[PDB]
Design a protein around this nucleic acid. Structure first.
Ligand SMILES: [Mg+2]
Ligand SMILES: [Mg+2]
Lengths: 257, 256
DNA sequence: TAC
């Protein structure tokens, strides 16, 4: 069987809903949909948006109103849902969904943005570490893992149009890039890079200066899998033509027998 | 599907081979690669360089040793290959490959350089004309055409850092610039200019005075298509960060 | 910097 997973930072779920997100959803027909940056209060979202037919939905909102939050729609009944690493400061921000689908755990993570201050760069980097711990523990216990979402970092120079200009900016600091190196080094694989080695493949573009249409962007959204499981991924692609947010969606297809 | 074509004046194929050209090739994975200025004698090129796995290769060398020559690597063979306009003085210089891939003909042309003398400026301008005749005839017969390579001319002031300084130099003469106007006027489209209107977009830089790193260069390498076919090009870009020659590669992507 |  083929299983299709889509990840998308929607930059506010009401914003894209007004833009016809539900129509794109019914067109795309993923088995599981992972969303980052919901912003809205789940209980007071449109009923049509909470209960889309054929899917069970899960919302993990931040404590702060109108901020962060993630969500998962799934055709597959999950055998558990965990919403944190069990570390207070990392679990109150609405960044974490870990869903068990038997063949694999699926991590839907909105990784912190480090731009706004030095405090938040530290917080991001330490979130990186807590996530590595968590996924390693699950992986060593024998679970296959799929990790998707917005990492807020471009891995290599190939992953953003403007590498030199940003070597000093959060999202392309050598500290952040080393963590991804270390993460990969721990037995995890950047799925998109299994199939496509071309530059100019991006998932986020600045709203300012017509950047998307000039294709001056970054790859911030990844699907990762543990090494053992990699032979199950048939494809990993970028849905470049889907608009409505400063991020575009990314797809994963896995084959399971 | 999506088909990727790359055009690159390698300024001598041995020179860039030594510089790790084969490694860039395997990184980039074009469906078709078009190369201008081979210089070397095909039969005595490295076997690794002639027979790269996954590609058929075609070399069209000049009669003159160590001079000019063009080449095409292609994952999918063409059904025909023509190596000239059928005009003697234009066809002995290793400047011309016309490959038929059914959906389109692909012209891989190393256009002549007019700097060295008045004789060669005339030769270049008349080569321009013979090429216009040819592509027009193929286009009128209904074929879709992609033309790529080194035109040895910057079209407009936007296409070189130093326009006033060179209004008197071959490569930016008004005579050469008018021919590109007339060529476009004949129903052909400068693909790069469909997507990017910024200045400072160049494909060649002088080796002297750190010109590349000061970005004082020229756009001399183009992908052109006939008007009818233009809706099929998804993108046309310059691969600025690829080194090894005084020219950098340019890319085309088409959806068939 | 166009040799
Ligand atoms: Mg956002
Ligand atoms: Mg040269």
């Amino acid at each position: 069987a083929v299983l299709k997973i889509i990840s998308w930072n929607v930059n506010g779920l009401r914003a894209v809903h007004r833009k016809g997100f539900l129509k794109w959803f019914m067109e795309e027909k993923p088995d599981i949909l992972c969303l980052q940056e919901i912003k809205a209060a789940p209980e007071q979202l449109p009923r049509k948006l909470r209960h889309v037919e054929g899917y069970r939905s899960f919302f993990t909102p931040a404590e702060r109103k109108g901020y962060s939050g993630v969500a998962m729609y799934t055709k597959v009944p999950p055998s558990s849902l965990r919403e944190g690493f069990g570390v207070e400061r990392f679990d109150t921000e609405g960044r974490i969904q870990i869903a068990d689908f038997d063949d694999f755990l699926l991590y839907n993570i909105y990784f912190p943005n480090g731009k706004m201050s030095e405090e938040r760069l530290k917080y991001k980097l330490e979130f990186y570490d807590a996530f590595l711990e968590d996924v390693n523990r699950e992986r060593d216990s024998g679970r296959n893992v799929i990790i998707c979402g917005d990492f807020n970092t471009a891995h290599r120079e190939i992953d953003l149009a403007r590498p030199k200009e940003n070597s000093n900016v959060s999202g392309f600091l050598p500290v952040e890039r080393a963590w991804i190196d270390k993460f990969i080094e721990n037995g995890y694989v950047d799925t998109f890079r299994m199939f496509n080695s071309d530059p100019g493949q991006y998932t986020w573009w600045s709203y300012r200066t017509r950047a998307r249409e000039r294709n001056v962007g970054w790859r911030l959204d990844y699907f990762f899998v543990n090494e053992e499981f990699k032979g199950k991924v048939k494809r990993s692609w970028i849905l470049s033509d889907v608009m409505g947010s400063d991020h575009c969606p990314i797809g994963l297809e896995i084959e399971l027998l």
